[PDB]
Structures are given as C-alpha cells and as structure tokens.
C-alpha cells in the first residue's frame, strides 16, 4: 500500500561525482536506493548557496516539505530530486515557466514538457505549450539537480496562455491519482 497525500512522491539522491546533464542524474537515481524520501507538496524550492548536498542545505531548499524527510542525508558534493505522481489538470493548453539552477526535466503522461539538459546559474525559461486531452489526474514526473554552488527549483504552470502562473502544490497534486482529503 502506497501512501495517499496531496503531493508527489519525492526521492533525494546525493553523489560525489559530477552531474552535468539529465542522463547523469537519471543514472544516479538508477544506481542505488534514495538517500532520503519526502512528500513534495509545495514545489517551489530554494534559493540557497554553498551546495544543496552539503549540511542542512537540502532541508532549507525543501522548506515546507522538509518535515517529511525520511532521514537527514550526509554530505555529498552534488545532488538532486526525482518526483513522481499525479497532477489534476482539466483538458486544455498549458505551459511551464521554470526558474532553476542547475537543470531539470518535467514529463507529463510520458512526454517531456520542460527540459534544461545542462548546468546553469539561476535562469527562468518559458517553455513551449502542450495539450492535455482528457480532464483528470495526469501522470507527472520531475528531475532537478545541483552540480554545486547555488540551487533553486520553481516550475510554475500557466493554463491561460502565459498570463498567470501557479506553483504545483497540495491544491492539485496526488501521490497515487486518488483524490486526497488531507
Ligand atoms: C554558484 O553559482 C553557479 C552554480 O550554482 C551553477 O551550478 O553553475 C554556475 C557556473 O559555474 C555558477 O555560477
Ligand atoms: Ca533508485
Ligand atoms: Ca545533511
Ligand atoms: Ca521555501
Ligand atoms: Ca559537482
Ligand atoms: Ca548549482
């Protein structure tokens, strides 16, 4: 039985190897069990300095979500998160606008909808639009990492052609696709 909460299932992975791109972080995820798990209920993390994977920087980055950490990871030089679950979206057109250091990839129903496949200091990208064909809980996953230095991750979403954007949070997230009443 998987817990039902208004958020995505979060895993944190640290490493002392360099993370240069999405493939490197995905390989880290594949290589071992998560260094910590958490509930990602308010996906607006950071900004901070001096390496996400050091000290209590992960706690600071995750903020409101850090109280669900399964453990306090030890130090690493590099690290990132893998989030997976569901997001309620009505049928229609949407686009992400993501602020991040370093890179990331967001997929919905198996299709990438926001990608930065490299390291970068803090930068905001307005991504291309995508469509949702059927209203309901859509499958979503995210990866984000920090190679070192500063770190931030805020993937906002627009339903109105880029006029307004919202953070993905407990209003619309579900860990299993069932309706949360939490
Ligand atoms: C600490 O500053 C940032 C770092 O966070 C980013 O990963 O890579 C950038 C270039 O090294 C740095 O300027
Ligand atoms: Ca794993
Ligand atoms: Ca720590
Ligand atoms: Ca915060
Ligand atoms: Ca590094
Ligand atoms: Ca960084």
Author numbering: 10 to 191
List sentences quoted exactly from the publication behind this structure.
MpPA14 (Marinomonas primoryensis PA14 domain) lectin is a domain of a 1.5-MDa adhesin responsible for a symbiotic bacterium-diatom interaction in Antarctica. Bioinformatic analyses indicated the presence of an ∼20-kDa domain near the C terminus of MpIBP that is a member of the PA14 family, which is a carbohydrate-binding lectin module widely distributed across several kingdoms of life. PA14 domains share a β-sandwich fold and the presence of two consecutive aspartate residues in a cis peptide linkage (DcisD). The DcisD motif coordinates a Ca2+ ion that is directly involved in binding polar vicinal hydroxyl groups of various carbohydrates.
Similarly, 3-O-methyl-glucose cannot bind MpPA14 via the 3,4-diol because of the substituted methyl group on its C-3. This sugar compensates by binding using the 1,2-diol of the β-anomer, resulting in its considerably weaker binding to the lectin compared to that of glucopyranoses and mannose.
